[PDB]
Homo-oligomer: A and B are copies of this chain.
């Protein structure tokens, strides 16, 4: 199949006459089985039938379950006629260090470039110029640590010299909240791609289980710190309300203005295909 069916709403799923029956409170939709490719369930209120699951085993469609946090938890494993994604994981095991370092360096370059550009939009040209200099100075293997050096400049510029990531405040809890939402979306996209998220792009630290998605989500991180800078005076609840609007807000992809979900989807697909094909093209995202 082609279409990827994802359920974000309370609903029931049934199987009748080779037709998937999706029912939600607003309307009922019937989708042919040959059209569906991957099935993902975002929320915990979704009701499904083991008959439909049995049909999805013959159809080979990948079934993805998610928790209340929307982080993917388990997936359906058939005993026979396995899906192609399980065959795709072996290439992820075969990912070369040169390709991983190229993609990682490109990601760090995109994030640092977005930080410098957002400081330019905030009209700090000295700090924006410094972060741009570190961007042009970034190198492989990261001997200079210009990302960690760009961090302090970015946060100090945004929230002031007194602010830091290590201190406990509604601003840092807000940053971790936005990074949690982005980590959920990008992690969901990596799970859609089927690659194991425990294998990271950054070789040095394997501690986190999300390392792949956490490395992919970095070029899109400064979009959060903008809203956190504007709303930084508001209480953590208000900052959560403002960060919740990012899903509804539209942003500019290089090709066209698109939703964040589609942007992250295309970016992740280009990343995975580029890693399996050893660096055909690197997706670039700019604020």
A191 interface hit (Cβ, 8 Å): yes
A254 contacts chain B at the CB level, 8 A cutoff: no
Q: A201-247: which have CB < 8 Å to B?
A: 206-211
Q: How many copies does the complex hold?
A: 2
Chain B residues in 8 Å Cβ range of A197: 79
A211, B86: Cβ atoms closer than 8 Å: yes
Tell me which of B50, B72, B79 contacts A79 (CB under 8 A): B72
A96 lies within 8 A of chain B by Cβ: no
1/0 per residue, CB under 8 A from B, across A113-133: the answer is: 000000000000000000000
Q: Are B79 and A74 in contact (CB under 8 A)?
A: yes
CA distance A51 to B51 in the complex (A): 18
A190 to B75, CA, bound (A): 16
A82 near B49: Cβ-Cβ < 8 Å: no
Rounded to whole angstroms, the CA-CA distance of A87 and B207 in the bound complex is: 7
Q: A41 contacts the other chain (Cβ, under 8 Å)?
A: yes
List 29 A-B residue pairs with CB atoms under 8 Å apart, sorted by A's residue number. Answer: A44-B50, A47-B47, A48-B50, A50-B65, A50-B66, A54-B66, A54-B68, A54-B73, A57-B65, A57-B67, A58-B67, A58-B73, A73-B78, A73-B79, A73-B80, A74-B77, A74-B79, A77-B77, A77-B209, A79-B183, A79-B197, A80-B198, A82-B209, A85-B209, A86-B208, A87-B206, A89-B196, A89-B198, A89-B206
